Amino acid sequence: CKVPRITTHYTIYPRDQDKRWEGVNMERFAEEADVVIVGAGPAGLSAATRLKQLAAQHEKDLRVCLVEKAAHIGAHTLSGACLDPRAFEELFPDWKEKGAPLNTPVTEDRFGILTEKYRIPVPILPGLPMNNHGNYVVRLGHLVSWMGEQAEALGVEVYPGYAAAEILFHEDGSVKGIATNDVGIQKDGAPKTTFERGLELHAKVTIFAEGCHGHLAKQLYKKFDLRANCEPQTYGIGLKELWVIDEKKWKPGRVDHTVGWPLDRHTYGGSFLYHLNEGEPLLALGFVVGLDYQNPYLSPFREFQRWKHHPSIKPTLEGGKRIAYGARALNEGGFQSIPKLTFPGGLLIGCSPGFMNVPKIKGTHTAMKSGTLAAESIFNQLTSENLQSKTIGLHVTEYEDNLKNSWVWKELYSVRNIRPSCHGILGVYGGMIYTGIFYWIFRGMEPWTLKHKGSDSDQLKPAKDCTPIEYPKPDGQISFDLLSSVALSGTNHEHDQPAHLTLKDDSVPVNRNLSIYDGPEQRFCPAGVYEFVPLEQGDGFRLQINAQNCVHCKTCDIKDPSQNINWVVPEGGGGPAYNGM
Ligand SMILES: Cc1cc2nc3c(=O)[nH]c(=O)nc-3n(C[C@H](O)[C@H](O)[C@H](O)COP(=O)(O)OP(=O)(O)OC[C@H]3O[C@@H](n4cnc5c(N)ncnc54)[C@H](O)[C@@H]3O)c2cc1C
Ligand SMILES: COC1=C(OC)C(=O)C(C/C=C(\C)CC/C=C(\C)CC/C=C(\C)CC/C=C(\C)CCC=C(C)C)=C(C)C1=O
Ligand SMILES: CCCCCCO[C@@H]1O[C@H](CO)[C@@H](O)[C@H](O)[C@H]1O
Ligand SMILES: CCCCCCO[C@@H]1O[C@H](CO)[C@@H](O)[C@H](O)[C@H]1O
Ligand code: SF4
Ligand code: NA
């Protein structure tokens, strides 16, 4: 054996095309519902909840099935989480006595610009977007878990551990529904004696709420040419760890943000540090880096680990304990990047299509509202005659009409130029200047909309033209390595299954990436999944994919300069085991 056909997933090598599957029956059982929702995130749960609420108010029968990758609800949820209650209280005006975990109202907002040695404080006025008056600091994972609890109580059929692995289409071309992941296929693609076909969930309308860079939505965009009038989405990667600190340095209700060191002015990114007020002297902290970065040598993980040593931060975690680690990609393309959210047989909500306010670093409240609106609109179409056809699947276009008229649209429109304004000669500092003028003073009224520089994927420079970055060795107390970090994510998968990190051509990572960019996949992956192993015969490397370490952040599918990777779901239940992240 060899070079190793790293790729054996059925999505690249159809088993309808390989002899090893000759005798196997691929017949799947099917279940019928009115609405099928993919992803138990704040958006999917908002949609599900509201739909079962609308059903109760008007006494109608509605079968709503919600499927999620996570072993249990909230396990793949990663956010820093400063919450704008606006849409949440709309869905649950009753939350306080019903027990929702919004125990930390923001009491102090701080922002600073860092240099290697110091911190420059920045005045936070009520007029800027980094103002958190009226908001809560929360462990999104727990709020999500709480939501799944209310959803079930309302009659929603929640299915954690089930990954939507395949979109179903009616012959007229509209979406019929989805099928869950099959199970029991070995690493090489061969069927096991335990092979088991997935479940088919049919509905009049399927809601897609996979979050930032959903793998089914990525293909949905293609199928219905949904990006026709929009700039492609732009992203950033968010790394995060939970810490237990010295009571003496615990300032409950405090929200910190910083820009500057260790990033150069042309690399977008920053930190967040929030003091939780849920009983323990706990801190949710993390780092963000725009995947539009240019240096192939940059490592967002090392930037984050190195960031903690800055003198304004290290003392705070000194004597502290790091108890969890996770990473997720987020949207930063904002308004200019919103695709068409509707098509025959389905809808897109939440960060999958992307409603993130990047300067506020908030996308949960808007993801919730989109779920609330999509629900109201769908129930609305299920409750009439006014029959639209030839698409057995409904085209709930009214959803986009109403979203365009909600506060969500104007909020995203108003901060649309902040992220793109960071592409000037002053980089992120130019963006700050632009924010003081056109937002703080003109609230984004300027008669124009700036554009992004294109896809994050073609923003990389060749390694020979750049200078490697010298990162410090972790000290095991404030900074750690990747392996220990992966352990604190509790992520895991059945080892004997084909890699879900699929390659379209098994030779480009060694022939192009390593050759031209020096294998950026070994540094942009926050989990150490891709590694180049020294070749046995003579001279080079081979790429090895350690699919079991994947935290499902979706970065590699976003940043690969050769766009040769396609992330798909592994067997349901695999991945992070985040608790209140
Ligand atoms: C580091 C970081 C910090 C952040 N800080 C804030 C903040 O302070 N405030 C704020 O409002 N927002 C913040 N956000 C953003 C916030 O987390 C998101 O906007 C929000 O979670 C988006 O929600 P969602 O409901 O679309 O999906 P997500 O929370 O992304 O969840 C999508 C769900 O879908 C599941 N899924 C995906 N594909 C499939 C499939 N095919 N089959 C089954 N299940 C599937 C996933 O497992 C996941 O649970 C932050 C994000 C990051 C990464
Ligand atoms: C952790 O996440 C992150 C942030 O959030 C904490 C960020 O910010 C940034 C970077 C910068 C951006 C997005 C531009 C945003 C604007 C800010 C932060 C406003 C702060 C300061 C201003 C506006 C200074 C005042 C302006 C002056 C004096 C100009 C002169 C004339 C007048 C207007 C009177 C990044 C990369 C980030 O990752
Ligand atoms: C041109 C500058 C004029 C004076 C601004 C006065 O008062 C302003 O109140 C708002 C709150 O509404 C804050 O956001 C501003 O930072 C503060 O300066
Ligand atoms: C600063 C980062 C991106 C924004 C591009 C804006 O530059 C333009 O400059 C001229 C001055 O020459 C102004 O009169 C215009 O109103 C402004 O849009
Ligand atoms: S393989 Fe991809 S999706 Fe998994 S953690 Fe690494 S970059 Fe994220
Ligand atoms: Na557009």
XYZ file of C-alpha atoms and ligand atoms in Angstrom:
717
model
C 0.000 0.000 0.000
C 0.467 3.704 -0.735
C -0.216 7.339 -1.396
C -3.324 6.385 0.256
C -6.692 7.461 -1.552
C -7.148 9.551 1.327
C -10.557 9.829 -0.365
C -13.130 7.056 -0.161
C -16.320 8.914 0.746
C -19.418 7.926 -1.219
C -19.980 11.525 -2.295
C -16.889 11.429 -4.443
C -16.918 7.745 -5.403
C -20.638 6.861 -5.759
C -21.233 3.305 -4.508
C -23.635 2.972 -7.384
C -20.346 2.932 -9.383
C -18.212 0.527 -7.365
C -18.488 -3.295 -7.345
C -17.950 -3.679 -3.600
C -21.631 -2.648 -3.307
C -23.209 -5.047 -5.763
C -25.481 -7.045 -3.453
C -26.404 -4.297 -0.945
C -29.989 -3.039 -0.754
C -30.108 0.758 -0.558
C -33.842 0.959 0.229
C -34.540 3.566 2.954
C -37.647 3.745 5.221
C -39.392 7.142 5.064
C -41.278 9.348 7.485
C -43.740 12.122 6.511
C -43.910 15.550 8.107
C -45.105 19.030 7.226
C -41.820 20.809 7.986
C -38.364 19.321 8.372
C -35.641 21.449 9.970
C -31.922 20.840 9.578
C -29.828 22.052 12.522
C -30.788 22.519 16.187
C -29.029 25.845 16.531
C -30.778 29.029 17.735
C -32.288 29.486 14.279
C -33.584 25.958 13.790
C -34.982 25.903 17.321
C -36.574 29.297 16.825
C -38.311 28.094 13.705
C -39.411 24.827 15.301
C -40.583 26.484 18.472
C -42.624 29.176 16.766
C -44.198 26.683 14.357
C -45.437 24.540 17.229
C -46.607 27.729 18.940
C -48.552 28.871 15.877
C -50.007 25.366 15.721
C -51.224 25.591 19.321
C -52.639 29.081 18.984
C -54.749 28.091 15.964
C -55.371 24.419 16.890
C -54.024 22.668 13.766
C -51.930 19.509 13.409
C -48.325 20.119 12.450
C -45.623 17.489 12.308
C -42.232 19.195 12.670
C -39.008 17.153 12.589
C -35.698 18.726 13.696
C -32.468 16.842 12.980
C -29.056 17.675 14.412
C -25.492 16.323 14.006
C -24.629 16.716 17.680
C -24.855 13.693 20.009
C -27.037 15.926 22.135
C -28.586 19.342 21.592
C -26.102 22.181 22.130
C -22.984 20.007 21.761
C -21.723 21.615 18.520
C -22.692 25.103 19.640
C -19.809 27.517 19.800
C -20.126 31.214 20.319
C -18.558 33.715 22.707
C -22.028 34.923 23.209
C -23.190 38.400 24.056
C -26.919 38.231 23.342
C -29.323 40.913 22.077
C -32.678 39.723 23.626
C -34.854 41.353 20.952
C -35.911 38.213 19.022
C -35.529 35.841 21.931
C -38.080 37.685 24.125
C -40.303 37.755 21.066
C -40.230 33.944 20.937
C -40.342 33.529 24.705
C -41.710 36.648 26.450
C -42.133 34.119 29.301
C -38.400 33.113 29.628
C -37.515 34.399 33.068
C -39.872 32.074 34.956
C -39.524 29.336 32.324
C -35.841 29.235 33.231
C -33.841 30.430 30.189
C -30.157 30.968 31.191
C -29.864 34.738 30.693
C -28.269 35.331 34.061
C -25.546 37.776 33.058
C -26.728 41.239 32.044
C -23.824 43.213 30.570
C -22.646 45.833 33.049
C -19.388 47.028 31.522
C -18.048 47.309 27.958
C -14.308 47.771 27.378
C -12.301 47.940 24.158
C -8.572 48.385 23.661
C -5.946 48.440 20.944
C -2.971 46.235 21.687
C 0.723 46.537 20.877
C 3.259 43.909 21.859
C 3.953 45.739 25.150
C 0.833 47.896 25.908
C -2.942 48.400 25.681
C -4.460 51.666 24.413
C -7.942 52.158 25.822
C -10.655 53.255 23.385
C -13.720 55.366 24.414
C -16.938 53.426 23.944
C -19.798 55.715 23.211
C -23.460 54.751 23.023
C -23.370 55.531 19.355
C -20.897 52.861 18.305
C -21.907 49.219 17.562
C -19.723 47.668 20.268
C -22.112 49.054 22.877
C -23.886 46.305 24.826
C -26.449 48.209 26.859
C -29.442 45.950 27.440
C -27.669 42.696 26.529
C -26.828 39.412 28.212
C -23.654 37.392 28.403
C -24.627 33.733 27.870
C -23.322 30.212 27.301
C -25.040 29.714 23.958
C -24.697 25.975 24.299
C -26.885 26.021 27.383
C -29.375 28.449 25.941
C -29.691 26.191 22.918
C -30.143 23.126 25.126
C -32.837 25.046 26.995
C -34.519 25.879 23.711
C -34.526 22.249 22.589
C -36.304 21.547 25.854
C -39.071 24.034 25.178
C -39.338 22.900 21.583
C -39.916 19.288 22.631
C -42.442 20.321 25.272
C -44.307 22.005 22.425
C -44.407 18.762 20.455
C -41.481 19.226 18.092
C -39.830 15.913 17.201
C -36.170 16.459 18.051
C -33.549 14.113 16.622
C -30.078 14.702 17.941
C -27.427 12.366 16.607
C -28.947 12.439 13.116
C -27.036 14.225 10.373
C -28.799 15.463 7.217
C -26.470 13.939 4.627
C -28.442 14.175 1.398
C -31.001 16.569 -0.080
C -34.119 14.942 -1.570
C -35.673 16.259 -4.749
C -39.107 15.772 -6.313
C -39.094 15.041 -10.001
C -40.345 18.562 -10.729
C -37.008 19.691 -9.333
C -38.120 21.074 -5.976
C -36.841 19.821 -2.606
C -38.714 16.801 -1.224
C -36.723 16.633 1.997
C -33.539 15.143 3.364
C -32.071 11.795 4.307
C -30.022 11.173 7.469
C -26.513 9.701 7.304
C -26.073 6.060 6.505
C -24.065 4.085 9.035
C -21.521 1.274 9.116
C -19.087 1.864 6.250
C -15.413 1.271 6.813
C -12.617 3.718 6.265
C -12.049 2.306 2.755
C -15.641 2.672 1.608
C -16.521 -0.980 1.878
C -19.809 -1.995 3.418
C -19.765 -3.633 6.835
C -21.996 -6.468 7.946
C -23.655 -3.743 10.013
C -24.198 -1.309 7.160
C -27.396 0.628 7.636
C -29.181 3.036 5.337
C -30.256 6.450 6.511
C -33.728 7.749 7.171
C -35.743 9.713 4.619
C -37.710 12.678 5.947
C -40.268 14.071 3.481
C -41.957 17.453 3.927
C -43.839 20.179 2.089
C -40.999 22.495 3.074
C -37.576 21.794 4.531
C -35.821 24.506 6.591
C -32.032 24.700 6.295
C -30.369 25.958 9.479
C -26.899 24.430 9.382
C -25.226 27.659 10.480
C -22.073 29.257 9.047
C -21.024 27.425 5.857
C -23.560 24.575 5.915
C -22.523 21.684 3.697
C -26.048 21.064 2.295
C -26.568 24.838 1.706
C -23.274 25.036 -0.190
C -24.804 22.666 -2.758
C -28.227 24.319 -2.489
C -26.702 27.600 -3.616
C -25.528 25.815 -6.746
C -28.786 23.992 -7.464
C -30.963 27.096 -7.475
C -28.446 29.811 -8.392
C -29.098 31.654 -5.109
C -25.893 33.759 -5.141
C -26.903 35.358 -8.487
C -27.299 38.812 -6.982
C -24.819 38.745 -4.187
C -21.123 38.948 -3.381
C -19.778 35.627 -2.092
C -19.812 35.123 1.690
C -16.651 36.164 3.611
C -15.627 34.494 6.848
C -13.503 34.454 9.927
C -12.489 31.628 12.254
C -13.375 31.765 15.927
C -11.358 29.847 18.543
C -12.590 29.766 22.106
C -11.728 28.391 25.500
C -13.477 28.417 28.875
C -11.549 29.382 31.976
C -12.039 29.225 35.725
C -10.122 32.161 37.228
C -9.117 33.630 40.624
C -12.238 35.248 42.240
C -10.039 38.324 42.748
C -9.852 38.913 39.014
C -13.485 37.962 38.239
C -15.540 40.996 37.171
C -19.061 39.628 36.405
C -20.935 41.433 33.652
C -17.742 42.682 32.054
C -17.287 42.459 28.278
C -13.797 42.987 26.778
C -12.686 43.266 23.152
C -9.296 44.066 21.565
C -7.660 44.585 18.195
C -4.070 44.991 17.206
C -1.214 42.757 18.404
C -0.533 39.961 17.623
C -2.074 40.787 14.267
C -0.464 43.099 11.702
C -2.773 45.944 10.465
C -3.753 44.091 7.284
C -4.985 40.970 9.080
C -8.541 41.311 10.342
C -9.189 39.786 13.763
C -9.483 40.294 17.463
C -10.289 39.008 20.909
C -13.270 38.757 23.187
C -13.312 38.130 26.922
C -16.581 38.003 28.831
C -17.021 37.493 32.602
C -19.943 35.095 33.203
C -22.153 35.625 36.253
C -23.606 32.146 36.716
C -22.073 31.297 40.078
C -18.479 30.347 39.237
C -15.644 32.867 38.550
C -15.864 31.863 34.879
C -14.585 33.372 31.662
C -15.584 32.781 28.054
C -12.710 34.004 25.872
C -11.458 33.688 22.348
C -9.982 34.966 19.131
C -11.129 35.717 15.601
C -9.200 35.892 12.339
C -10.624 36.742 8.950
C -10.018 33.937 6.546
C -9.152 36.625 4.065
C -5.647 36.700 5.575
C -2.702 36.692 3.139
C 0.208 34.916 4.830
C 0.266 31.144 4.275
C 2.369 30.864 7.438
C -0.235 32.382 9.758
C -1.931 30.112 12.281
C -5.105 31.384 13.866
C -4.626 28.868 16.780
C -1.104 30.077 17.527
C -2.254 33.701 17.209
C -4.897 33.035 19.877
C -2.581 31.106 22.224
C 0.051 33.830 21.820
C -2.558 36.562 22.349
C -3.193 35.379 25.918
C 0.351 36.340 26.915
C -0.157 40.049 26.251
C 0.475 41.905 29.523
C -3.046 43.194 29.786
C -4.478 39.721 29.645
C -2.034 37.174 31.117
C -2.371 38.432 34.714
C -6.076 37.792 34.472
C -5.663 34.117 33.667
C -2.607 33.617 35.860
C -3.360 30.922 38.397
C -6.357 30.016 36.294
C -7.557 26.741 34.826
C -8.542 26.156 31.175
C -11.487 23.736 31.032
C -12.700 23.643 27.434
C -11.652 24.504 23.870
C -13.551 24.815 20.587
C -13.528 26.551 17.225
C -16.166 27.569 14.661
C -16.144 29.678 11.513
C -18.366 32.732 11.400
C -19.722 35.033 8.738
C -18.367 38.516 8.200
C -19.595 39.238 4.674
C -22.722 40.762 6.138
C -25.352 42.477 4.035
C -23.550 42.320 0.659
C -23.315 38.536 0.977
C -26.946 37.564 1.657
C -28.146 35.098 -1.066
C -31.728 34.370 -2.151
C -33.223 32.517 0.817
C -35.993 30.669 -0.918
C -36.595 27.954 -3.454
C -39.231 25.355 -4.337
C -39.391 23.036 -1.352
C -37.178 24.884 1.176
C -35.819 27.912 3.089
C -32.485 29.166 4.420
C -32.277 30.785 7.869
C -29.637 31.765 10.411
C -25.943 31.977 9.696
C -26.092 29.446 6.878
C -27.293 32.262 4.634
C -25.776 34.661 7.070
C -27.315 37.504 9.087
C -24.308 38.318 11.244
C -23.675 41.895 12.363
C -19.895 41.776 12.305
C -19.005 45.018 14.112
C -21.315 44.044 16.963
C -20.096 40.438 16.649
C -23.698 39.346 16.839
C -25.606 36.941 14.669
C -27.727 35.047 17.161
C -30.523 37.549 17.609
C -30.944 37.931 13.792
C -30.706 34.166 13.289
C -33.498 33.801 15.808
C -35.702 36.401 14.137
C -35.214 34.782 10.750
C -36.389 31.493 12.265
C -39.400 33.211 13.801
C -40.324 34.808 10.463
C -39.783 31.741 8.330
C -42.124 29.884 10.705
C -44.864 32.469 10.621
C -44.681 32.552 6.810
C -44.708 28.753 6.383
C -47.585 28.145 8.791
C -49.205 30.896 6.815
C -48.931 28.925 3.554
C -49.943 25.608 5.155
C -53.060 27.309 6.561
C -54.653 28.514 3.328
C -55.674 27.073 -0.033
C -54.238 29.691 -2.429
C -52.344 26.890 -4.027
C -49.023 27.421 -5.734
C -47.802 24.793 -7.966
C -45.869 22.446 -10.027
C -43.368 22.019 -7.417
C -44.980 19.646 -4.966
C -42.710 21.542 -2.656
C -43.799 24.988 -1.473
C -41.918 28.105 -2.469
C -42.481 30.293 0.568
C -41.247 33.490 -1.052
C -43.175 35.540 1.447
C -40.390 34.660 3.949
C -37.789 36.807 2.166
C -40.360 39.555 1.626
C -40.973 39.763 5.371
C -37.364 39.396 6.389
C -36.547 42.338 4.072
C -39.086 44.384 6.016
C -38.024 43.434 9.534
C -35.489 45.237 11.723
C -33.012 42.546 10.707
C -32.630 44.035 7.256
C -31.997 47.609 8.336
C -29.563 46.547 11.074
C -27.379 44.658 8.642
C -27.731 47.380 6.072
C -26.525 50.061 8.496
C -23.201 48.352 9.348
C -22.532 47.018 5.854
C -19.454 49.123 5.129
C -17.574 48.594 8.318
C -15.801 45.282 7.510
C -14.925 46.159 3.857
C -13.567 49.529 4.907
C -10.718 47.553 6.500
C -9.083 46.960 3.126
C -7.401 50.336 2.905
C -3.734 51.188 3.428
C -4.311 51.528 7.170
C -6.028 48.159 7.310
C -8.056 47.624 10.472
C -7.105 51.071 11.770
C -8.577 52.556 8.618
C -11.722 50.639 9.427
C -11.877 52.182 12.870
C -11.487 55.641 11.402
C -14.190 54.907 8.875
C -16.439 53.669 11.714
C -16.015 56.930 13.679
C -17.021 59.007 10.684
C -19.651 57.145 8.774
C -21.254 55.190 11.530
C -20.738 57.044 14.790
C -21.538 60.348 13.066
C -23.626 59.343 10.049
C -25.111 56.033 11.249
C -24.274 54.477 7.879
C -26.351 56.904 5.798
C -23.520 57.349 3.245
C -24.914 56.995 -0.313
C -22.916 53.862 -1.246
C -22.081 50.243 -0.407
C -18.460 49.002 -0.353
C -17.456 45.630 -1.811
C -15.390 42.756 -0.384
C -12.117 41.711 -2.048
C -13.540 38.407 -3.317
C -13.311 34.863 -1.948
C -11.217 34.291 1.173
C -9.808 31.283 -0.738
C -7.891 33.335 -3.285
C -6.445 35.814 -0.795
C -3.368 33.717 -0.028
C 0.070 34.733 -1.267
C 2.673 32.181 -2.298
C 4.912 31.083 0.604
C 8.093 32.077 -1.238
C 6.856 35.687 -1.301
C 6.090 35.740 2.431
C 8.082 35.476 5.690
C 7.254 32.660 8.148
C 5.882 33.779 11.501
C 7.842 32.764 14.600
C 5.319 31.621 17.184
C 6.362 31.058 20.823
C 6.299 27.555 22.312
C 3.274 27.074 24.566
C 4.061 27.172 28.272
C 1.402 24.718 29.397
C -0.168 27.228 31.768
C -1.356 30.211 29.738
C -0.691 28.828 26.228
C -1.193 25.230 25.107
C -0.603 22.916 22.172
C -3.222 21.705 19.676
C -3.512 18.132 20.994
C -4.416 19.131 24.556
C -6.771 21.689 23.064
C -8.495 19.053 20.949
C -8.904 16.951 24.105
C -10.728 19.770 25.891
C -13.244 19.838 22.987
C -14.284 16.277 23.719
C -14.594 15.736 19.974
C -14.606 12.198 18.636
C -15.734 9.959 15.821
C -15.895 6.245 14.996
C -12.394 5.681 13.538
C -13.587 3.107 11.021
C -15.487 5.294 8.553
C -14.324 7.193 5.471
C -12.985 10.709 6.062
C -15.669 13.427 5.849
C -12.988 15.868 4.802
C -13.186 14.913 1.120
C -10.747 15.839 -1.621
C -11.787 16.224 -5.278
C -8.217 15.423 -6.395
C -5.924 13.573 -3.958
C -2.798 15.110 -5.468
C -3.332 18.840 -5.130
C -2.540 19.097 -1.413
C 0.982 17.815 -2.007
C 1.365 19.067 -5.600
C -0.177 22.574 -5.215
C -0.798 23.546 -1.558
C 2.426 22.297 0.029
C 4.355 23.135 -3.105
C 3.119 26.734 -3.514
C 1.697 27.704 -0.125
C 3.564 25.304 2.151
C 0.502 23.329 3.223
C -1.717 25.968 4.847
C -4.024 23.155 5.886
C -1.532 22.252 8.594
C -1.974 25.682 10.112
C -5.451 26.929 9.463
C -7.139 23.789 10.876
C -7.828 24.408 14.577
C -7.697 20.653 15.247
C -4.563 19.260 13.611
C -6.512 17.160 11.100
C -4.220 17.580 8.095
C -0.572 16.605 8.430
C 2.069 15.944 5.838
C 3.872 12.723 6.562
C 7.453 12.155 5.297
C 7.303 9.746 2.368
C 8.676 6.222 2.786
C 10.117 5.862 -0.720
C 12.759 8.570 -1.081
C 11.761 12.214 -1.089
C 8.536 13.919 -0.209
C 5.388 13.975 1.706
C 1.967 12.462 1.605
C -1.006 14.055 3.260
C -2.653 12.223 6.086
C -6.175 13.148 7.163
C -6.986 12.523 10.857
C -10.714 12.883 10.406
C -11.418 11.804 13.935
C -10.048 15.083 15.348
C -12.441 17.287 13.368
C -14.380 19.876 15.389
C -16.591 20.690 12.357
C -15.647 24.405 12.302
C -15.861 24.429 8.456
C -12.599 26.413 7.928
C -10.741 24.091 5.576
C -13.695 24.026 3.171
C -13.562 27.809 3.244
C -9.845 28.611 3.171
C -8.206 25.970 0.904
C -6.619 28.068 -1.850
C -7.278 25.222 -4.330
C -10.924 24.790 -3.219
C -10.207 21.089 -3.422
C -11.824 20.216 -0.065
C -15.525 19.544 0.526
C -16.671 19.076 4.097
C -19.591 16.685 4.512
C -21.113 15.185 7.595
C -19.515 12.127 9.305
C -21.762 9.521 11.011
C -24.293 11.336 13.181
C -23.161 11.871 16.742
C -19.553 12.519 15.774
C -17.683 15.698 16.615
C -17.308 18.130 19.575
C -18.852 17.492 22.950
C -19.098 21.189 23.895
C -20.825 21.999 27.177
C -22.158 25.542 27.426
C -19.806 26.940 24.767
C -16.091 32.540 18.339
C -17.511 33.035 18.064
C -18.041 34.054 18.847
C -19.428 34.555 18.626
N -19.902 35.560 19.497
C -21.227 35.935 19.291
C -21.786 36.922 20.226
O -21.198 37.490 21.192
N -23.168 37.223 19.978
C -23.981 36.671 18.943
O -25.169 36.931 18.743
N -23.411 35.788 18.117
C -22.087 35.430 18.296
N -21.538 34.429 17.402
C -22.372 33.912 16.438
C -23.416 32.939 16.765
O -22.842 31.773 17.428
C -24.121 32.609 15.453
O -24.667 33.699 14.668
C -25.281 31.604 15.601
O -24.966 30.402 16.301
C -25.795 31.196 14.293
O -26.840 30.300 14.458
P -27.553 29.234 13.778
O -28.785 28.980 14.535
O -27.648 29.588 12.339
O -26.509 28.033 13.813
P -25.363 27.460 14.566
O -25.250 27.833 15.962
O -24.194 27.637 13.720
O -25.784 25.955 14.491
C -26.016 25.198 13.279
C -26.333 23.762 13.727
O -26.588 22.950 12.631
C -26.035 21.592 12.813
N -25.874 21.023 11.449
C -25.146 21.556 10.390
N -25.236 20.870 9.293
C -26.053 19.809 9.647
C -26.602 18.717 8.871
N -26.292 18.582 7.585
N -27.408 17.805 9.511
C -27.708 17.994 10.831
N -27.274 19.004 11.644
C -26.475 19.898 10.957
C -24.764 21.962 13.521
O -24.321 20.843 14.218
C -25.118 23.149 14.453
O -25.631 22.732 15.745
C -20.202 33.943 17.554
C -19.625 32.892 16.741
C -18.341 32.430 16.966
C -17.858 31.296 16.054
C -12.885 40.646 18.352
O -13.540 41.125 17.233
C -13.110 42.356 16.510
C -13.463 43.731 16.755
O -14.344 43.971 17.800
C -13.799 43.854 19.127
C -12.904 44.786 15.861
O -13.167 45.985 16.030
C -11.911 44.467 14.744
C -11.332 45.598 13.868
C -11.885 46.882 13.493
C -13.168 47.178 12.870
C -14.069 46.050 12.517
C -13.533 48.556 12.561
C -14.484 48.723 13.716
C -14.638 49.953 14.447
C -14.310 50.137 15.797
C -13.739 48.968 16.609
C -14.573 51.479 16.414
C -13.625 52.011 17.477
C -12.919 53.321 17.408
C -13.135 54.550 16.664
C -14.233 54.665 15.755
C -12.121 55.751 16.888
C -12.623 57.181 16.773
C -12.387 57.758 15.522
C -11.669 58.918 15.167
C -10.983 59.769 16.274
C -11.485 59.405 13.710
C -11.268 60.891 13.731
C -12.389 61.870 13.617
C -13.791 61.823 14.232
C -14.856 60.755 13.871
C -14.385 62.764 15.276
C -11.603 43.168 14.546
C -10.623 42.822 13.428
C -12.157 42.086 15.404
O -11.910 40.911 15.261
C -20.022 66.049 15.668
C -19.952 65.549 17.096
C -21.082 66.131 17.955
C -21.476 65.866 19.433
C -21.949 64.527 19.998
C -22.662 64.455 21.395
O -23.190 63.494 22.417
C -23.164 62.231 21.906
O -24.280 61.344 22.332
C -24.297 60.041 21.593
C -25.456 59.160 22.132
O -26.636 59.389 21.365
C -22.946 59.320 21.670
O -22.941 58.152 20.846
C -21.832 60.255 21.264
O -20.617 59.589 21.348
C -21.812 61.505 22.153
O -20.681 62.332 21.836
C -11.549 53.919 3.694
C -11.874 52.530 3.192
C -12.935 52.540 2.078
C -13.853 53.652 1.537
C -13.606 54.381 0.179
C -13.908 55.922 0.162
O -13.498 57.210 -0.385
C -14.193 58.304 -0.790
O -13.238 59.351 -0.583
C -13.637 60.676 -0.977
C -12.443 61.621 -0.635
O -11.437 61.434 -1.625
C -14.974 61.068 -0.303
O -15.386 62.354 -0.763
C -16.049 60.013 -0.627
O -17.269 60.405 -0.014
C -15.574 58.634 -0.098
O -16.544 57.624 -0.433
S -10.801 19.473 9.239
Fe -11.758 21.329 8.586
S -13.705 21.354 9.565
Fe -12.489 19.865 10.764
S -11.569 21.203 12.384
Fe -10.034 21.088 10.687
S -10.535 22.920 9.442
Fe -12.310 22.620 10.882
Na -27.345 41.816 -3.048
